[PDB]
Design an enzyme around this catalytic site. Structure first.
Site, mmCIF file in Angstrom:
data_model
loop_
_atom_site.group_PDB
_atom_site.id
_atom_site.type_symbol
_atom_site.label_atom_id
_atom_site.label_comp_id
_atom_site.label_asym_id
_atom_site.label_seq_id
_atom_site.Cartn_x
_atom_site.Cartn_y
_atom_site.Cartn_z
ATOM 1 N N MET A 156 5.436 -4.030 -26.873
ATOM 2 C CA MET A 156 4.907 -5.325 -27.285
ATOM 3 C C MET A 156 3.401 -5.283 -27.542
ATOM 4 S SD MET A 156 7.452 -7.180 -27.647
ATOM 5 C CE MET A 156 6.539 -8.668 -27.997
ATOM 6 N N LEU A 187 12.033 -11.407 -25.519
ATOM 7 C CA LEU A 187 12.217 -11.527 -24.085
ATOM 8 C C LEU A 187 11.336 -10.523 -23.362
ATOM 9 C CD1 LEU A 187 16.123 -11.759 -23.969
ATOM 10 C CD2 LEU A 187 14.441 -13.591 -24.293
ATOM 11 N N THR A 196 8.247 -20.333 -20.671
ATOM 12 C CA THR A 196 8.644 -20.559 -19.297
ATOM 13 C C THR A 196 8.133 -21.841 -18.674
ATOM 14 O OG1 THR A 196 8.337 -19.688 -17.053
ATOM 15 C CG2 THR A 196 6.681 -19.132 -18.707
ATOM 16 N N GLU A 238 6.789 -22.002 -16.059
ATOM 17 C CA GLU A 238 5.528 -21.686 -15.399
ATOM 18 C C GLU A 238 4.393 -22.333 -16.174
ATOM 19 O OE1 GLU A 238 6.911 -20.434 -12.226
ATOM 20 O OE2 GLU A 238 4.755 -20.088 -12.451
ATOM 21 N N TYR A 285 -0.164 -15.446 -16.030
ATOM 22 C CA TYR A 285 1.156 -15.327 -16.634
ATOM 23 C C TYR A 285 1.453 -16.625 -17.362
ATOM 24 C CZ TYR A 285 6.208 -15.620 -17.168
ATOM 25 O OH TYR A 285 7.470 -15.772 -17.688
ATOM 26 N N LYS A 291 1.770 -16.994 -21.351
ATOM 27 C CA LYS A 291 2.991 -17.571 -21.909
ATOM 28 C C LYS A 291 2.669 -18.829 -22.696
ATOM 29 C CE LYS A 291 6.584 -15.042 -20.913
ATOM 30 N NZ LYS A 291 7.483 -14.544 -21.990
HETATM 31 N N1 LIG Z 1 13.752 -15.151 -15.866
HETATM 32 C C1 LIG Z 1 13.125 -16.315 -15.705
HETATM 33 O O1 LIG Z 1 13.393 -17.036 -14.749
HETATM 34 C C2 LIG Z 1 12.224 -16.628 -16.660
HETATM 35 C C3 LIG Z 1 11.854 -15.718 -17.552
HETATM 36 N N2 LIG Z 1 11.227 -16.041 -18.722
HETATM 37 C C4 LIG Z 1 10.763 -15.031 -19.685
HETATM 38 O O2 LIG Z 1 11.852 -14.667 -20.511
HETATM 39 C C5 LIG Z 1 11.859 -13.223 -20.672
HETATM 40 C C6 LIG Z 1 13.038 -12.545 -20.057
HETATM 41 O O3 LIG Z 1 12.958 -12.669 -18.642
HETATM 42 P P1 LIG Z 1 13.695 -11.712 -17.732
HETATM 43 O O4 LIG Z 1 14.747 -10.801 -18.332
HETATM 44 O O5 LIG Z 1 13.763 -12.040 -16.250
HETATM 45 O O6 LIG Z 1 12.518 -10.597 -17.603
HETATM 46 P P2 LIG Z 1 12.434 -9.065 -17.067
HETATM 47 O O7 LIG Z 1 11.079 -8.809 -16.510
HETATM 48 O O8 LIG Z 1 13.615 -8.825 -16.209
HETATM 49 O O9 LIG Z 1 12.679 -8.121 -18.323
HETATM 50 C C7 LIG Z 1 11.893 -8.207 -19.504
HETATM 51 C C8 LIG Z 1 11.057 -6.970 -19.614
HETATM 52 O O10 LIG Z 1 10.540 -6.704 -20.947
HETATM 53 C C9 LIG Z 1 10.220 -5.309 -21.031
HETATM 54 N N3 LIG Z 1 8.793 -5.185 -21.308
HETATM 55 C C10 LIG Z 1 7.747 -5.478 -20.469
HETATM 56 N N4 LIG Z 1 6.576 -5.147 -20.951
HETATM 57 C C11 LIG Z 1 6.869 -4.602 -22.192
HETATM 58 C C12 LIG Z 1 6.058 -4.070 -23.206
HETATM 59 N N5 LIG Z 1 4.730 -3.992 -23.128
HETATM 60 N N6 LIG Z 1 6.668 -3.615 -24.321
HETATM 61 C C13 LIG Z 1 8.003 -3.694 -24.401
HETATM 62 N N7 LIG Z 1 8.871 -4.171 -23.516
HETATM 63 C C14 LIG Z 1 8.232 -4.614 -22.421
HETATM 64 C C15 LIG Z 1 10.570 -4.770 -19.643
HETATM 65 O O11 LIG Z 1 10.847 -3.397 -19.553
HETATM 66 P P3 LIG Z 1 10.308 -2.625 -18.409
HETATM 67 O O12 LIG Z 1 11.179 -3.288 -17.363
HETATM 68 O O13 LIG Z 1 10.601 -1.143 -18.617
HETATM 69 O O14 LIG Z 1 8.823 -2.971 -18.298
HETATM 70 C C16 LIG Z 1 11.743 -5.656 -19.322
HETATM 71 O O15 LIG Z 1 12.781 -5.408 -20.272
HETATM 72 C C17 LIG Z 1 10.456 -12.778 -20.288
HETATM 73 O O16 LIG Z 1 9.579 -12.976 -21.389
HETATM 74 C C18 LIG Z 1 10.138 -13.744 -19.150
HETATM 75 O O17 LIG Z 1 8.749 -13.930 -18.993
HETATM 76 C C19 LIG Z 1 11.057 -17.377 -19.007
HETATM 77 C C20 LIG Z 1 11.415 -18.313 -18.084
HETATM 78 C C21 LIG Z 1 11.918 -17.924 -16.869
HETATM 79 N N1 LIG Z 2 8.245 -13.441 -6.024
HETATM 80 C C1 LIG Z 2 8.106 -14.045 -4.835
HETATM 81 N N2 LIG Z 2 8.000 -15.363 -4.770
HETATM 82 C C2 LIG Z 2 7.896 -15.799 -3.496
HETATM 83 C C3 LIG Z 2 7.880 -15.059 -2.334
HETATM 84 N N3 LIG Z 2 7.775 -15.886 -1.226
HETATM 85 C C4 LIG Z 2 7.733 -17.090 -1.723
HETATM 86 N N4 LIG Z 2 7.799 -17.113 -3.094
HETATM 87 C C5 LIG Z 2 7.533 -18.271 -3.939
HETATM 88 O O1 LIG Z 2 8.758 -18.721 -4.498
HETATM 89 C C6 LIG Z 2 8.518 -19.133 -5.877
HETATM 90 C C7 LIG Z 2 9.329 -18.395 -6.904
HETATM 91 O O2 LIG Z 2 8.774 -17.102 -7.125
HETATM 92 P P1 LIG Z 2 9.369 -16.138 -8.243
HETATM 93 O O3 LIG Z 2 10.792 -15.890 -7.897
HETATM 94 O O4 LIG Z 2 8.441 -14.985 -8.340
HETATM 95 O O5 LIG Z 2 9.324 -16.954 -9.654
HETATM 96 P P2 LIG Z 2 8.224 -17.847 -10.462
HETATM 97 O O6 LIG Z 2 8.864 -19.219 -10.376
HETATM 98 O O7 LIG Z 2 8.268 -17.156 -11.812
HETATM 99 O O8 LIG Z 2 6.985 -17.615 -9.619
HETATM 100 C C8 LIG Z 2 7.002 -19.243 -5.983
HETATM 101 O O9 LIG Z 2 6.447 -20.506 -5.679
HETATM 102 C C9 LIG Z 2 6.582 -18.064 -5.115
HETATM 103 O O10 LIG Z 2 5.240 -18.142 -4.683
HETATM 104 C C10 LIG Z 2 7.980 -13.647 -2.420
HETATM 105 O O11 LIG Z 2 7.977 -12.820 -1.504
HETATM 106 N N5 LIG Z 2 8.092 -13.221 -3.738
#
Ligand SMILES: NC(=O)C1=CN([C@@H]2O[C@H](COP(=O)(O)OP(=O)(O)OC[C@@H]3O[C@@H](n4cnc5c(N)ncnc54)[C@H](OP(=O)(O)O)[C@@H]3O)[C@@H](O)[C@H]2O)C=CC1
Ligand SMILES: Nc1nc2c(ncn2[C@@H]2O[C@H](COP(=O)(O)OP(=O)(O)O)[C@@H](O)[C@H]2O)c(=O)[nH]1
Length: 321
Positions: free
Chosen positions: A58, A79, A124, A126, A148, A152
């Site tokens: 990316m 993603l 997100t 967030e 972050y 985003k």
């Molecule tokens: N899951 C959630 O609750 C939420 C997530 N999102 C967003 O939606 C997306 C999907 O989330 P989710 O699957 O949990 O995320 P993950 O972190 O599980 O996976 C996405 C990541 O993108 C790849 N990636 C990271 N940096 C790079 C880079 N520089 N170039 C290419 N690929 C890269 C990672 O590979 P590698 O692991 O090898 O770094 C991994 O595939 C993300 O953009 C996330 O921020 C939005 C709302 C909520």
């Molecule tokens: N990741 C993470 N979050 C934590 C932890 N303890 C409490 N939290 C809190 O729980 C929430 C959810 O965290 P996370 O799963 O990382 O998702 P976010 O909603 O993307 O921050 C936040 O308010 C965090 O600060 C911890 O050990 N790890």
């Protein structure tokens, strides 16, 4: 019918890829270079061999451009991201480059090579950070609380801007927290369920968490990727909040997880300040009314069911180690 999914090795990428494959899409997955195989999620879903991997990053606009050109995608799902809030203060620049500029890189690749491909930006909740409304929808003013969230926010707005500036079919999915058995171990839900599993199997004695008072609207990634896809099926691009509309404290989620294995979280939970956030997002509660109305999307998996499958998944993994 081609789709380019960045972050294909991530949680959502895996579920989205699976969804896209069942719909006959040739799925191109952008994969950053890693020292070891990182496709376990794809193998877990049994689709690792059904994806056309695109070697790129990316942060490398050229490789992103190349991947778009090679994939000739009708749909691009961005993603890929440094998706962990907990790491955004440590590396705010990479977070901004990857999560923010990375979006611009894709939008540019689309704008310059195939302006007709539909784009999905993984925005997100967030971005709402310090929530400006009890329940956040598309109109709730954003208030990011981490590099972050800010990165985003850039990703979200640049997507909107390309949509508005060039008429690109670019949509920002403002998804609230969604977990699954593929959820990264960094996130509290997977961390908890993984800990519950190891604790339950006597491989661990405690669970160290930070702020267990934080309230999160947790959904199932499997359900959420459907909204992403639906968003790109719309004739006109738009932004949508995707959430469950139910927020829960990390504590209760933690309780749900331990209780699922007949344990009392209080016996293993230890509050560790090392996990507190510099600027916390105390509560997120999404209002997916628009998504339901327009996309016909609605969450199906409840937090309880979600935690259950995650705990079960981790129990299987831990017992296999
Ligand atoms: N899951 C959630 O609750 C939420 C997530 N999102 C967003 O939606 C997306 C999907 O989330 P989710 O699957 O949990 O995320 P993950 O972190 O599980 O996976 C996405 C990541 O993108 C790849 N990636 C990271 N940096 C790079 C880079 N520089 N170039 C290419 N690929 C890269 C990672 O590979 P590698 O692991 O090898 O770094 C991994 O595939 C993300 O953009 C996330 O921020 C939005 C709302 C909520
Ligand atoms: N990741 C993470 N979050 C934590 C932890 N303890 C409490 N939290 C809190 O729980 C929430 C959810 O965290 P996370 O799963 O990382 O998702 P976010 O909603 O993307 O921050 C936040 O308010 C965090 O600060 C911890 O050990 N790890």
């Amino acid at each position: 019918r081609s789709a380019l999914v960045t972050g294909i090795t991530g949680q959502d990428g895996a579920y989205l890829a699976k969804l896209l494959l069942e719909k006959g899409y040739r799925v191109h997955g952008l994969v950053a270079r890693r020292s070891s195989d990182t496709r376990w999620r794809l193998r877990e879903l049994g689709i690792e061999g059904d994806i056309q991997y695109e070697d790129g990053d990316m942060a490398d606009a050229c490789s992103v451009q190349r991947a778009v050109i090679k994939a000739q995608p009708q749909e691009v799902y961005n993603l890929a991201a440094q998706s962990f809030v907990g790491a955004s203060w440590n590396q705010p620049v990479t977070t901004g480059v990857v999560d923010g500029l990375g979006v611009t890189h894709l939008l540019e690749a689309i704008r310059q090579f195939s302006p007709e491909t539909r784009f999905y930006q993984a925005s997100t909740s967030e971005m709402f950070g310090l929530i400006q409304a009890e329940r956040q929808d598309e109109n709730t003013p954003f208030y990011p609380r981490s590099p972050y969230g800010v990165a985003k926010l850039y990703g979200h707005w640049i997507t909107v801007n390309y949509r508005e500036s060039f008429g690109l079919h670019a949509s920002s999915g403002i998804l609230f927290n969604h977990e699954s058995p593929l959820r990264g171990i960094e996130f509290v839900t997977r961390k908890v369920t993984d800990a519950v599993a190891r604790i339950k199997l006597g491989k661990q004695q405690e669970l160290r968490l930070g702020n267990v008072d934080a309230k999160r609207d947790w959904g199932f990634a499997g359900d959420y990727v459907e909204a992403m896809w639906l968003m790109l099926q719309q004739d006109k691009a738009d932004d949508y909040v995707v959430a469950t509309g139910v927020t829960t404290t990390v504590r209760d989620m933690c309780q749900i997880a331990f209780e699922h294995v007949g344990l009392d979280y209080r016996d293993f939970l230890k509050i560790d300040p090392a996990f507190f956030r510099p600027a916390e997002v105390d509560v997120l509660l999404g209002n997916p009314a628009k998504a339901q109305r327009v996309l016909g999307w609605k969450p199906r998996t409840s937090l309880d069911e979600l935690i259950r499958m995650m705990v079960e998944a981790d129990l299987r993994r831990v017992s296999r180690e």
